[PDB]
Amino acid sequence: LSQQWEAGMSLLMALVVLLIVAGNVLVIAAIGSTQRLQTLTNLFITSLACADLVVGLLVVPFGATLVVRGTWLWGSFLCELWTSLDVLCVTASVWTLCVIAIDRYLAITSPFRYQSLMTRARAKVIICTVWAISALVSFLPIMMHWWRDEDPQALKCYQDPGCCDFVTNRAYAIASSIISFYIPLLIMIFVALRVYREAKEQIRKRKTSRVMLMREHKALKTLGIIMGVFTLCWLPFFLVNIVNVFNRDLVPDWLFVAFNWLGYANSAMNPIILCRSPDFRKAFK
Ligand SMILES: CCCCCCCC/C=C\CCCCCCCC(=O)OC[C@H](O)CO
Ligand SMILES: CCCCCCCC/C=C\CCCCCCCC(=O)OC[C@H](O)CO
Ligand SMILES: Cc1ccc(OC[C@@H](O)CNC(C)(C)C)c2cc(C#N)[nH]c12
Ligand SMILES: NC(=O)CN(CC(=O)O)CC(=O)O
Ligand code: NA
Ligand code: NA
Secondary structure (H helix, E strand, C coil): CHHHHHHHHHHHHHHHHHHHHHHHHHHHHHHHCCCCCCCHHHHHHHHHHHHHHHHHHHHHHHHHHHHHHCCCCCHHHHHHHHHHHHHHHHHHHHHHHHHHHHHHHHHHHCHHHHHHHCCHHHHHHHHHHHHHHHHHHHHHHHHCCCCCCCCHHHHHHHHCCCCCCCCCCHHHHHHHHHHHHHHHHHHHHHHHHHHHHHHHHHHHCCCCCHHHHHHHHHHHHHHHHHHHHHHHHHHHHHHHHHHHHHCHHHCCHHHHHHHHHHHHHHHHHHHHHHHCCHHHHHHHC
16 A cells, blocks of 8 residues: 555656656747747746756655655765755745846836846846855855754754755754745845836836737736746745744644645746747747
């Protein structure tokens, strides 16, 4: 019966991996093989797609084996690397959504300046800075063991190469969550709502035709959907992560894991969402 669950979950995880990996390669292949999709925003989309791709190839396969076997098979170093890449992908994603919100705000409010000043190369530089800072804030604290808790349970997990539970002290949990999630999430939401407001005002009345503005706003809508779904997928985990560092009995471990898998599931959603945008649909066809 445990073999039926092992075999059953194994196959379900293979399909999740295939969906995340294939989905996010297509998105990147759609963008790179099509003139229409060579926009600055879609270079920022490529960063999200890269983060979702790392999740599909490195994070989810290691995670699947932990869920199905109930122990960590890959030793203490790969536990630490796995955790660092997991943290990196979430951080780079939410900061990239924050860059997209800000970019688009400046694009609608100063289209004249924006278009003379922003270039394809300058977008890549911003993306690099995001991933470089994300890697700093992600890898450094994990390398330095700033996250470790002093409880016997925690210490036993650290002595055991078979335990890869990210048991953390409250200082690290609150601080890392603020820098890597809550701050960029709040900036993204605040700025996106203003973009929504300003787009909404421009159609109501730019010299631009009203039908051209509606085509601009369909693309803006895709981004807000990605933004909204990212929030739904990750905000539960991060709220529960805080509750769990204050009291471990308030959140059972299996429930913690379920919330985590809702987060990983976001990596599968974006290609499917991008599929319903008009230009991306043609490209996939
Ligand atoms: C630039 C990188 C930014 C990354 C974000 C900053 C991370 C640093 C946070 C804490 C370090 C200190 C760790 C040791 C502190 C122990 C505090 C403590 O005792 O807290 C709870 C207790 O362990 C029961 O859960
Ligand atoms: C609960 C999630 C909270 C987090 C939220 C993150 C920020 C997202 C911001 C705006 C929503 C984007 C979608 C806006 C769509 C407006 C389109 C519209 O006008 O309505 C239907 C359309 O007319 C039919 O053709
Ligand atoms: C800054 C940052 C980014 C992403 C995070 O969680 C992502 C989640 O997928 C982690 N999964 C494992 C628990 C399996 C490592 C956390 C957790 C903490 C804590 N404490 N800090 C994080
Ligand atoms: N066997 C190894 O290569 C590494 N070991 C030790 C470690 O990961 O620190 C794993 C184990 O003892 O189960
Ligand atoms: Na992601
Ligand atoms: Na361990």
